[PDB]
Structure 1
Amino acid sequence: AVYHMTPPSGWLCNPQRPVTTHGAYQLYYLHSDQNNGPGGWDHASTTDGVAFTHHGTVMPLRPDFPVWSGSAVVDTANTAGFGAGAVVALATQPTDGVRKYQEQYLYWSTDGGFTFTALPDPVIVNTDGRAATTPAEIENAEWFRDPKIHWDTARGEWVCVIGRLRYAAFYTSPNLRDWTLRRNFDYPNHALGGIECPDLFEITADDGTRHWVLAASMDAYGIGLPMTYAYWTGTWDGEQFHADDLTPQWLDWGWDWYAAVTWPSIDAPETKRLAIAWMNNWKYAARDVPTDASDGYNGQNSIVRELRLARQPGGWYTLLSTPVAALTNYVTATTTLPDRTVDGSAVLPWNGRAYEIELDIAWDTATNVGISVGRSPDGTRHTNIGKYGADLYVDRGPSDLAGYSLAPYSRAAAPIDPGARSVHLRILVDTQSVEVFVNAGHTVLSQQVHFAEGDTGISLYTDGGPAHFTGIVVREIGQA
């Protein structure tokens, strides 16, 4: 990947919410030497959200004691007693290597999050596990992970949300060590998924109102929905979370945007948040990838995006997404191409493997319009991005690579007004991925695509009528 974070080597997995220290973002992420094997937390730093500097392991795997997802906060006020400004983290670990014993262990750092020390006794015990007898009880005790901590300014205390089987548990604490159980958060459509890597935060909307947001990585594929990140706007009152609407909204409609995490930006923590996700999907994550053979590593993170909460008619709010602005600083060349009308298909006179392409498409009677990226000159390979019916789709099927096929997960789609007769697209193409930001960023589709060396072309196509392709600009991107 030219501009997507990847591990120097090994298996990359769940990113952990970055903390801000030493004037930079300290990102942590699950890492293992063996693909889908046990591991711990590794560390990387980024000043702009694009380029990263890897620092190695920070919370190592220990004999039959791996470290799973969690979160870290800067104890500015020294509420935990490990020193003012100490970086305090909570992570799920299966005690004694026993899955039903998975509980939350605390780790702390006094050097801005570079080295950590472990607290021998877990701060949030899995009592369910030490009583689970029936299959149901055990299955439930085996889903108690990914603690996400948030400082509730209004109540002056720490609140933590933990993922369970189809529900989320909440705990509060004044010192990060002594936690008090609160009321679970239940949602009605369990076909949605069961809550992993939950997110909890406060953000101020474009109208100045403040809001809480509870989210989590799901798996609603069974009901035609994403396997990414869903969120419920609402309020946390210290006892329970009140979702404004029990039907959640989605942040990505692509195949690969899992275990996403968000964090407040440096320049505007209350209104703008940054977000990054592991670009993989458990339907096929456990396998070797092209990069394994070519570079000895497996997995990359998504591009970092900026989020903001916008008010909607009726009084509800929704998040909008956009590529981190800093990406612009890595643009090495900018190519504009003349507007053109095409009826059928046309190959653009440009080739590349890592770039961003923006364009507008307008049509009338056409029943399908789109653009193909990663097009091989032999015409057999390409990823299609277009509008059809009520879908703004991304079809990576024609890009399936022998020995690494992503089939049958080929056509992803975001909802789009079926009456739309034009659309704006901003597409980020890298060596192993395609990320599509639609229109104003309300819908985004992120997916890994295994492009071959020669998959460099771009073509335009329509079905059922001509379309006018305008404002075509391609920005080549170079790494650091």
Structure 2
Amino acid sequence: GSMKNLIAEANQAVEQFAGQVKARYYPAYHIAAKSGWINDPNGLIYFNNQYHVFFQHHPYNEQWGKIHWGHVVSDDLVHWRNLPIALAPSQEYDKDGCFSGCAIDDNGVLTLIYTGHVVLKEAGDKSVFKQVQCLATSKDGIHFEKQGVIVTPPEGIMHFRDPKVWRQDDQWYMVVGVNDHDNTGQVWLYHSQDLYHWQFVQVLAKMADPNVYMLECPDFFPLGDKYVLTCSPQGMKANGYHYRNRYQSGYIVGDWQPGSAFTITQDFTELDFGHDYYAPQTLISHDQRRIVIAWMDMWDSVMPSQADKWAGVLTLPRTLMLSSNNKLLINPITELKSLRGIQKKITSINLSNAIQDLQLDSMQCELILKIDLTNSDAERAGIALSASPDGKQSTLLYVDNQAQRVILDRTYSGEGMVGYRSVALPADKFLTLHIFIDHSSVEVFVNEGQATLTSRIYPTSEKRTLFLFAENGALRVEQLDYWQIKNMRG
């Protein structure tokens, strides 16, 4: 009945099914539970010389259900260690889930502020529920004590969730996402002197598209001379190359100071153009980088790992910097280089109407592929990742010279979902693809961080290699760097 006993029960279920988890799709250097289901990352913080990541977690099976907070820690944002579960549903205010939230340092006390979820009437997607903001503390970083409800919404407001709290002007601010009376998604800003008593300040942001019914997972933070709002809109219609995923994740750049509206200088932009990127949260690193982690997955997608008694992976952590035109340059954190093994460097690889097996293991590896766009005039030219030795199965990452786009096509990748995602080719003589392959994922960083593509893949081949290919013309690879990537856990 006590949360201490509910956490012990939950930890025992995770430990029980951990032995049934197959390696084929389990990430070597991304965050996953030992077994069972995870989704959105929560409570990101650098606290007492360590990086903490929590996540939405169903401990009892590989599907979504009674949500707990899972927990990992690292010294270096890379060597993530599994910890015991932090929060289990245990009170009227959180009976049906400890939903998303953040962490803060309250005068040396690690403090979690999360949405408590309770179902009031079960009608599937027509369900009525109660969402309020709740607070928990820890003296040791491992065991947490609930301190109860701290923010209740207005009457008629139901969707009211995903608090992100920060200190400013010896005061605290909170952003939450809300579905308003007129059925529009908004981010609301609240403030507090004590973390227990909160007052509404303003509607921080809404979107012009009236079909956006929710803004999940708001994070509002300074970056250079601007403020950035990252969030996850629901209800944006897929439009050409835009908003292809079931739900969106992206960013708004503007100007704000306490007492002012958030005046938008750059409208909503997707954070990642791939298939599997949802529910970003950020933290400030020790050296004051702005770091984003997201769920490397998408609601309603086929999840082949569920056959193996686990599901859910987080993205690599990525740095956020403003370009001079106030777009986010997004790059892998430098600490990932610590996982690098055997380096292989190939220079000046030409192909014309041909394929080439590079004979490089594609289970867990990092590539830097520099392509000469002027002289790579093939209709389709690039790399086949995580490929069967017969080349029948692969994840295609290539220049389409007709579309003038980079294509990530998982149609022939293995189990689960088909089709492609894409970005516009950058205005540059050279295209650099910085590619991280794990057992069930591809992350691509384009050029200096101008764009990223993140997709899950589920290869079925016993051995995984890489091919280069050029169809109907030439590929010019100026340089290919390859590293094997070590398991982060040892």
1:355 corresponding residue in structure 2 = 365
Higher mean C-alpha deviation, range 155-164 or range 88-97: 88-97
- The equivalent position to 1:106 in structure 2, one of 123, 127, 135, is 135
Once superposed, which parts of structure 1, at least 4 consecutive aligned residues long, lie more than 6 Å away? none
Superposition pairs of residues 197-212 of structure 1, within 5 angstroms: 197-204=217-224, 210-212=225-227
Are 1:473 and 2:481 counterparts?
A: yes
Aligned to 1:462: 470
Identify the residue that residue 41 of structure 2 maps to in structure 1.
15
Alpha-carbon separation, structure 2, partners of 1:288 and 1:371: 24
5 Å-filtered alignment, 1:44-193, equals 44-62=72-90, 64-75=95-106, 84-95=107-118, 97=120, 99-111=128-140, 113-120=141-148, 122-128=149-155, 132=156, 141-152=157-168, 155-165=169-179, 166-184=185-203, 185-191=205-211
The answer to whether the 8 Å contact 1:275/1:305 transfers is yes
Are 1:243 and 2:237 an aligned pair? no
Counterpart of 1:367 in structure 2 is: 379
SS at match of 2:338: helix
* Partner SS state of residue 151, structure 2: coil
- Deviation sequence 1:385-413 (CA, Å, 0-9, x none): 11222422211111141xxx213xx2011
- When the two structures are superposed, what TM-score results if normalisation uses the length of structure 1? 0.85
Q: Which residue of 2 aligns with 1:256?
A: 276
Deviation at 1:96, TM superposition (A): 6.3
Aligned residue number for residue 417 of structure 2: 406
Deviations along 1:16-58, one digit per CA (max 9) or x if unpaired, are: 1412222111111111123111221121101111121121111
Which deviations, in whole Å up to 9, do the C-alpha atoms of 1:45-81 show, x marking residues without a partner?
Answer: 0111112112111111237331100111112xxxxxx
- What is the DSSP-based 3-state SS (H/G/I as helix, E as strand, rest coil) of the residue aligned with 1:69? strand
* SS at structure 2 position matched to 1:175: coil
Quote the Cα distance in structure 1 between the aligned partners of 2:260 and 2:134: 23
Aligned runs of 1:409-448 on 2, under 5 Å? 410-417=419-426, 422-448=430-456
Secondary structure of the structure 2 residue equivalent to 1:8: coil
Tell me the TM-score normalized by structure 2.
0.84
> Residue 309 of structure 1: which of 322, 328, 333 is its match?
322
Contact kept in structure 2, 1:216 and 1:231, CA below 8 Å? yes
Q: Distance in 2 between the 1:215 and 1:148 partners?
A: 11
Give the CA deviation at 1:376: 0.7
Residues 245, 211 of structure 1: alpha-carbon distance in 2 compared, 3 angstrom cutoff? closer
CA RMSD of aligned residues (A): 2.1
Aligned mates of 1:173, 1:26 — CA distance in 2: 24
Is there any run of 5+ residues in structure 2 with no aligned partner, and where? 1-26, 122-127, 180-184
SS in 1 for 2:214: coil
Runs of 5+ unmatched residues, structure 1: 76-83, 133-140, 205-209
**Preserved CA contact (<8 Å) 1:5 1:51:** no
Identity among equivalent pairs (%): 24
Alignment-derived partner of residue 299 in structure 2? 282
For residue 85 of structure 2, give the secondary structure of its aligned residue in structure 1: strand
> What one-letter code is carried by the residue in structure 1 that aligns with 2:195?
L
- What does the per-residue CA deviation read over 1:441-474, in whole Å, with 9 as the maximum and x for residues that have no partner? 1100011100124351211222332121121111
Equivalent pairs, count? 435
Partner of 2:9: none
Question: Counterpart amino acid of 1:437?
Answer: F
Partner SS state of residue 238, structure 2 = helix
1:376 is the counterpart of 2:376: no
